[PDB]
Structures are given as structure tokens and as C-alpha cells.
Amino acid sequence: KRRVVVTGLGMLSPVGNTVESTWKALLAGQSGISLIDHFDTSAYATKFAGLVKDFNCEDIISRKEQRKMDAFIQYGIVAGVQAMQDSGLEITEENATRIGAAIGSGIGGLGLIEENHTSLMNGGPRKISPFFVPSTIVNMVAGHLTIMYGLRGPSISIATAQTSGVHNIGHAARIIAYGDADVMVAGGAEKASTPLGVGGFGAARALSTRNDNPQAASRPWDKERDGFVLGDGAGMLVLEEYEHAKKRGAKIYAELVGFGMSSDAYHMTSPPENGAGAALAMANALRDAGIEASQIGYVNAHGTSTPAGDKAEAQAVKTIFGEAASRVLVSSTKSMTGHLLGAAGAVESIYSILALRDQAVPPTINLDNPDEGCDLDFVPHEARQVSGMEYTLCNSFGFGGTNGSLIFKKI
Amino acid sequence: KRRVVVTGLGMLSPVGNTVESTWKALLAGQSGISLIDHFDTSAYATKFAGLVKDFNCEDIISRKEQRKMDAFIQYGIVAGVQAMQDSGLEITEENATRIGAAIGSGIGGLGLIEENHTSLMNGGPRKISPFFVPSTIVNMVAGHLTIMYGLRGPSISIATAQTSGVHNIGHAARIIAYGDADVMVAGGAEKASTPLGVGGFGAARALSTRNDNPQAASRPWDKERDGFVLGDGAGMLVLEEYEHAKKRGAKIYAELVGFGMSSDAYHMTSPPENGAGAALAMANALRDAGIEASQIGYVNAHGTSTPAGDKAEAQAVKTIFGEAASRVLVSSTKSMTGHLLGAAGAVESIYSILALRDQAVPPTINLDNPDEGCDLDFVPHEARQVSGMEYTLCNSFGFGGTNGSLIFKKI
Ligand SMILES: C[C@]12C[C@@]34CCC(=O)[C@@](C)(CCC(=O)Nc5c(O)ccc(C(=O)O)c5O)[C@@H]3[C@H](C[C@@H]1C4)O2
Ligand SMILES: C[C@]12C[C@@]34CCC(=O)[C@@](C)(CCC(=O)Nc5c(O)ccc(C(=O)O)c5O)[C@@H]3[C@H](C[C@@H]1C4)O2
């Protein structure tokens, strides 16, 4: 029986370029949402997003190497390096074979897709870059990282849209527990704040359109919600088999105890009002962790700020928690962070970890008027102190009715 | 201890729109490569590909629904339906929760990406389709299928480039054996024969350029190789837990016994001359299946027809088989099929299955002059009869040094 633990964290987000800076901001209820400036937004109904401020990889990636990779890859590599370094793990010829990675993304390299496509339109296939494929495809973050570190263990990339972060972490853990690896860098990366990303989700009427106050747009469970907010970033965890960790005197953030998946079997871009899909994923994580819903101190909701999605998760929470529905704290950091799609579940797994270490839960900001008929503690406006919280649960849901949940335990 | 078996197959390929028609063609050494006609290839260095002839889904997908999906999705759904039907499985409210899917793709919806991007360039974000996201992203095949069949079990989508087919099947099996599901539709779909796909891999100098004889271009291990051949299609298997299968009187094609993954940690678009990555994946599949390299009757190689890739796999084969290197048959169906990237490992898992049922191995066509210094039986030109073959092994490798292998056992 092999237990899995988190021994390293890395992160790039709209509120901080490091793990600690990001957590500090979240507990302080800060928003990382700002107006888009890197492309003309005149014709765009949505003109803001949660961007990564002052990104720098000069010391991690050569501009020679930078040319062969989309922003999403650069972000993921940086965050993955941060995590590898934070873990203290030393790759040796003994090790190599037993260390891998499970890193995905929702949409991948849109920015370079647009660039290459624009080039082809203007001057033919002759203008497409030799790096088109390798610089845009989803598995490129695991690709570069394995190379940078000489990792020869299993490497996979789960592209399950907005549910990727959770899936990659879940399966990385599965890969470890199963015996295929001893250590795994896992998580996701995304950079979809481009004409296509913004134009695309905007075309589906999925984005908040509150340009007059970009910072108040992400408002999960609030009566005035008008769609999700797009956020860029990457989040990475180094997962390791318990004994392998101890034996090397690794610092252990927390333990990965449960992982559950489910399918909505309902609609391509929406969940059922009843949240039956979300309920199953959560129900599966508990059964996997062998605990009861009553033991969860906090839930880092998927809470995207869409009219239909927020209601469904709330429904699902009432269903799984029932009695304790009022005693469990639920909050959506997307209220500050925005929605980082393929990286959401990753960064949000980190917040679920830190909430355990620091016995502090971050707030769902902008919750001025919650929906009516809801008995839930959405941790509105301000961070909240907690006492004997041993477990946290993290949800991620995605287009295609794909759901996943991770349960983390203190120590 | 939960064993996994194949109880259903579905497939669309360049040589047939069904499982059986495709196998018949392969054993008859037929090529499905032809000249591209759906887009002007004048400026293109590569002007041919392995296309799906006369695709029809009218009876499976409404043109109303067809509008919201890229060719890659349509292909995958059709092949997935074929597999579901072939299995005889009846989804009930008891079942639903325990049936899922693991289906990926290498690049996804290029054709609709180009369409939406072209539209945006010509008339702004106003022209982007509300279905941009849902119609192009990789997890959309699992999405539609789970919905079409009321599947509520776990659903994931592994995007590991040219290695996806194998990964999805591997993990679907893992998901089943672990206890998270009883049945899984698994495999991959791809349709990258577009200006971007052809222009893209062509820009990296990865494609055969033999337009004077499209049918002779895919030539694995042949001295005159000049790069891989692009092929479209989808391949799907219904994996099921042994007892669950029997209990319902399921027809059982074969059993999934081993699955191994590895990372090259070498180059973004190329393997090491020594094929150490491929060796590890194969070495891991055997250890997983608990058998010895000598027990493998046939290897369905990754064999893409690139100068460097073919040499590396051969090296890896010599390494793992050693003594038996000469007694094992290795063949690359891509010599006829082309390279279907994310779907390669899927369709090729089917051929590895059928080679067991039918004790017949398909040929590596176009092998007029093999490389020098190679003791291997590449099953050149003609299919080959086999006697007591109990196991077959299937390899898939991809950009980012991501490798995987599946081992199948007779009965
Ligand atoms: C056809 C419609 C119904 C519509 C009703 C009003 C809504 O509320 C939204 C805006 C989104 C529903 C939803 O929450 N989808 C959803 C989801 O299933 C899973 C994940 C996420 C995520 O962002 O991770 C997500 O966004 C839907 C979307 C756009 C169109 C308007 O589909
Ligand atoms: C920088 C270069 C070196 C170069 C040397 C000559 C070659 O032989 C090729 C054409 C491809 C090497 C290769 O086999 N890559 C490779 C791989 O690692 C994994 C999977 C596949 C697949 O198709 O599933 C694949 O194609 C390479 C490519 C293009 C450029 C020319 O990279």
C-alpha cells in the first residue's frame, strides 16, 4: 500500500509569481483581474482577464529556446522548475527511471497557433514555423521538463479542459501508488487570454462582460453573476511516495488521500441543475480516501461565476454534505484569480494544501448578494480562521461533463 | 486482482471504415495513401496523405449536431459507437456509474481552428463560432460519447501527441483494474490532414515528400525513407473487467496484460540513436505483464518511416529481445496506413489484438532495401502465418520523448 504526499510546489498566477506570494494575496482578498492590453479589445465584448504580471524566464529558458514555445509552455516550465527546486529532490542515474510527470492544459498554445495561422494566410505554408507542432501541443510542458531534469519515468498529459489540473494530479498519484514511479511533477498550464480564447468563450456567451469594473466581475454564487473570468497561470506539485520522501528528509506539505472522477452525461457546455455529476466525483473521492463528508473542513469549489454552474455545484454540495452542509466552508478563489482552465485544478490544489498547513481558508470575494435558498457557508468577503481542519477537498469540472475531485489530508 | 479484456472494437482508417474491412486490407498489403484534394496543395511540399474515404455519420450524428464538431470528433464518435455496439453492453441505471471513457487525440480540431481563425481575421471576433471551444478541444470525443450513451463513470482524455492511443488504452485499463470503473471505451481520434497539419509537420521537415508515388512513401526501415506519412482515422476498444465480461456472456477478443511508460529526456522532436526510451517502455510492459521478451510473438512497431526514429526502435528491439531478436516478428502497419498520430496507438492496438485471434501478422510494405546491420524480421512485403502466438506488444512514441507500450495476451 503506497501513500502519496506533496513535497514541492510551484506556481504562476494573476496574483503572484510564486507559491507564497500567491497565497498571501488570496488570504488578503486581492483580485488579479485587469484590462487586456496586449491585443486590441475594441470589438471584444470582454476586455479584461487575470494576467500573469511581469513574467520572466530569462534565467530558466534561453530566448533561443523561448522561440520554440508558447506562453503556456514557458509558464508551465517555470512553475515546474520552482516545484522541482522547492522539493530538494536530486535526480541521479538510480532515480531518473522512477521520476516522471503528468502535466496538461485545457486549450494549449493558442497564441502561437494564431501566429502560425496568420503567417500561412499572409504568405503560404512557407511561413509556418518548423516549431508549429512542438511549440503548441499540450504535452510540451512535460516534454521540456523531463528533458531539463533527465526524468525518464512515466510522462503523460491529460487534456480534460477545465478539469485537467485535478486529473493530472489524480493520475500522477495513481501512477505513483501503482508502482510505476516514485515521484511525479504534476499539474497544468494555460495562457488563453488571446483573440481566440476571449473571442471563443465570448462567442459561447460564457464570459463576464463587466468591463466597467473588471475586479468585481468574478462573483461566484452572487445574484449578479454574468459568466466566468479568464485567468492565465500554471500550478505544479511534486508528488512522492511516503517512504521515498521520508528516507530523503523531504519537507511534506500534505498527503493526497482521495481522487474521484465522474461524467455528467448531460450537455456539452453545461451541467445538470441537480449537479449529479459533481456529486458523484466528490462521492468517489471520499470513498477513495475512506472518510465521510463530515470530515472535510473546506471545499475549494470549481465556482466559476456562471449562472448555471454555480447553482449546480451548490446543489451537489448540499447533496454530499447534507447535515454538515452548513458546517463545511466552501469558497471559490476564482473570485480573485479568474478561471485558469487546465491550470485551475492545479493552482487550486495548492490552495487546498496551504489551507491545511496554515489552518486558514481564503474568501469568495464579491459575494454581495448570494443566491436565495442556499444554506451554505461560501466564506464571503474575508479569509476565515479554522481550528482542527485535517482534510480539504478540491473540485474541478469541464466541458464534456468531465468531473474530478481531490482530497488532501493534513500530514 | 482485476484483469482487463477487450470486448468491443470500432475503427475508421485509410484502408477501411470498419474493423474487419481494415484488417482484411492490411493482411492484403494494401495502401490507403492518396493525393490530397480538399485543399490546394500547390505550395505544399507534401501533397498526399492517408485519408478516410467516404466518411458517413448521417445515421449516427445529425447535421444539426455535426455543425458543432471537427472531423476528428465525428470520426471518434462513429468509431466509438461501432465499438459500443460490437460489445453488446447494455447501459442501465445500475451500470451508468461504472462505465466511462479515456479518449484522446494528438492535435485535435485543426480544421475548425483554421475556420474560426480565418473568420476572425476576415470579420472580427463577431465571426468566431459559439462552438469554437467545444468543437475543437481534445476531450470532446469522450464528451459526446458519454452523453450519447448515458455513461457516468470516469472520463479522461490523454493528449500525448503520437503516443495518445496507447496511453488512453493503458490508463483506461488502469482505471478498470484500480476499481474506479468496470468498463471503458478507450482509444483516440485524429484528422490532421489540413494546411496547418501538413504545413506544420512539413515545416519541421518530418514528412515524406515522395509525391511521384504516394503509395510507396511510407517505407519503415527502408534505406530510401524520407519522413513519415500523415493518416486520419479513429480506433476504439471497449475494455472490461474479466468477471463483468463473462457474467454477461461477452465476446472476448483478447486480454490487456501489460502497460509501460517511459521518457526519453533527450530531444523535443527526436529520440536518441540508442532508443533507450523505447527500450524502457517495452521493458516496463513486460515486467507489468510478468512475462519475458521471448514470449512476444509479434511487435506492432511505431515505425514511422523517418530516418532517425526507425533506427532507434530497431536498436531498442535488439536490446529488449537480444537472443530472440531474430525470432520475434516486427512490422509497421504505418507502411500502409500512414501515421494517425493520436489514433495510431489505438488502431495499432486493434491490429495487435487481431493478429492474436487470427494467428496472422501484417506486413511492412515497401521494404525494398532494409538498413544495413539489422538482424530483425520486419515482415517485409507479405503477411505472415504464425503458430503458437500467445502475446503481442504494441509501441507508440511521441514528441517530448513520451513513450508507451501495451502487451496483449490470447484469451
Ligand atoms: C449553451 C450554454 C448554456 C449557458 C447557460 C448560462 C451559463 O451559465 C453558461 C454561460 C455556462 C454553463 C456552465 O457553467 N458551463 C461549464 C461547465 O459545464 C463545466 C465547466 C465550466 C467552466 O467554466 O469550468 C463551465 O462554464 C452556459 C454555456 C454557454 C451557453 C449559455 O452553455
Ligand atoms: C529536429 C529534427 C531532427 C530530424 C532528423 C531526421 C528525422 O528522422 C526527423 C524528421 C524525425 C525524428 C523522429 O523520428 N521524431 C519522432 C519522435 O521522436 C517521436 C514520434 C515521432 C512520430 O512521428 O511519431 C517522430 O517522428 C527529425 C525531426 C525533424 C528535424 C529533422 O526533428
What are the CA-CA distances from residue B38 to residues A150, B116, B231, B385 (Å)? 43, 18, 14, 39
What are A384's three cell numbers? 476565515
- Would you list the DSSP string of A26-51? HHTT---EEE--SS--TT-S--EEE-
B200 lies within 8 A of chain A by CB: yes
B5-258 classified as CATH 3.50.50.60: no
Q: Which amino acid is at A218?
A: S
CA separation for the pair B404, B266 (Å, rounded): 16
Give kind and range of the element (H or E) at residue A178: helix A164-178
CB atoms within 10 A of CB B290: 10
Count of all residues that appear for chain B in the document? 411
What are B292's three cell numbers? 519475458
Which residues lie closer than 8 Å to B96 by C-beta, 6 or more apart?
A: A265, B150, B151, B152, B153
What are the CA-CA distances from residue A180 to residues A83, A154, A176, B118 (Å)? 21, 7, 6, 44
- Torsion over CA of A320, A326, A327 and A331, rounded to 10 degrees? 80
Atom number of ligand 1 nearest to Cα A270? 18
Cβ–Cβ of A153/B402 closer than 8 Å? no
Cβ–Cβ of A261/B155 closer than 8 Å? yes
CB atoms within 10 A of CB B90: 7
* Count of CB pairs separated by less than 8 Å, A with B: 272
The partner residue sitting opposite B178, judged by closest CB among A155, A174, A265, is A174
For the CA of B311, the nearest ligand: 2
Query: Is A259-411 the same fold as A5-258?
Result: yes
B228 lies within 8 A of chain A by CB: no
A40 lies within 8 A of chain B by CB: no
What are the CA-CA distances from residue A260 to residues A268, A375, A396, B172 (Å)? 20, 25, 11, 14
Question: How many helices (H) and strands (E) would you count in chain B?
Answer: 14, 14
Contact A352, A394 (CB under 8 A): yes
Contacts of B203 in chain A (CB under 8 A): 125, 128-132
Name every protein residue with a CB atom under 6 angstroms from any ligand 1 atom.
A 162, 204-206, 227-228, 269-271, 304, 306-309, 339, 397-399
How many angstroms separate the CA of residue A362 from the nearest CA in chain B? 29
Q: Which residue of B has its CA nearest to A132?
A: B200
Which residues lie closer than 8 Å to A389 by C-beta, 6 or more apart?
A: A297, A298, A355, A356, A359, A361, A410
CA separation for the pair A265, A269 (Å, rounded): 11
- Residue spans per domain, chain B: 5-258, 259-411
A259-411 classified as CATH 3.30.565.10: no
3-class SS of residue A18 = coil
Closest by Cα among B16, B38, B37 to B27 = B16
CA separation for the pair A219, A227 (Å, rounded): 9
Q: From the CB of B162, is ligand 2 less than 6 Å away?
A: yes
What are B117's three cell numbers? 481563425
- Phi and psi for B86 in degrees, rounded to 5? -60, -30
What are A275's three cell numbers? 449537479
Which residues lie closer than 8 Å to A201 by C-beta, 6 or more apart?
A: A192, A207, A228, A230, B132, B133
Ranges assigned E (strand) in A346-409: 360-361, 384-385, 391-398, 402-409
Which residues lie closer than 8 Å to B246 by C-beta, 6 or more apart?
A: none
Q: Specify the residue for cell string 536530486.
A: A90
CA separation for the pair B410, B202 (Å, rounded): 40
Q: Is B213 exposed, middle or buried (0-12, 13-18, 19+ CB in 10 A)?
A: exposed
What are B350's three cell numbers? 486493434
Which residues lie closer than 8 Å to A335 by C-beta, 6 or more apart?
A: A31, A218, A219, A220, A303, A305, A363, A364, A365, A366, A367
Contact A299, A188 (CB under 8 A): no
Atom number of ligand 2 nearest to Cα B308? 8
Q: Which residue of B has its CA nearest to A205?
A: B130
Nearest-Å Rg of the Cα atoms of chain A is 20
Q: Specify the residue for cell string 471537427.
A: B70
For the CA of B205, the nearest ligand: 2
CB atoms within 10 A of CB B267: 14
Contact A134, A140 (CB under 8 A): yes
CA separation for the pair A357, A135 (Å, rounded): 37
CA separation for the pair A301, A310 (Å, rounded): 9
B284 lies within 8 A of chain A by CB: yes
B302 lies within 8 A of chain A by CB: no
The partner residue sitting opposite B265, judged by closest CB among A129, A137, A147, is A147
- Mutual angle of helices B110-123 and B195-203, in 10-degree steps: 100
Contact A296, A393 (CB under 8 A): yes
Contact B13, B52 (CB under 8 A): yes
CA separation for the pair A309, A58 (Å, rounded): 39
Cβ–Cβ of A139/B200 closer than 8 Å? no
Contacts of B131 in chain A (CB under 8 A): 203-204
Alpha helix (H) residue ranges in A46-139? 63-66, 71-87, 110-123, 132-136
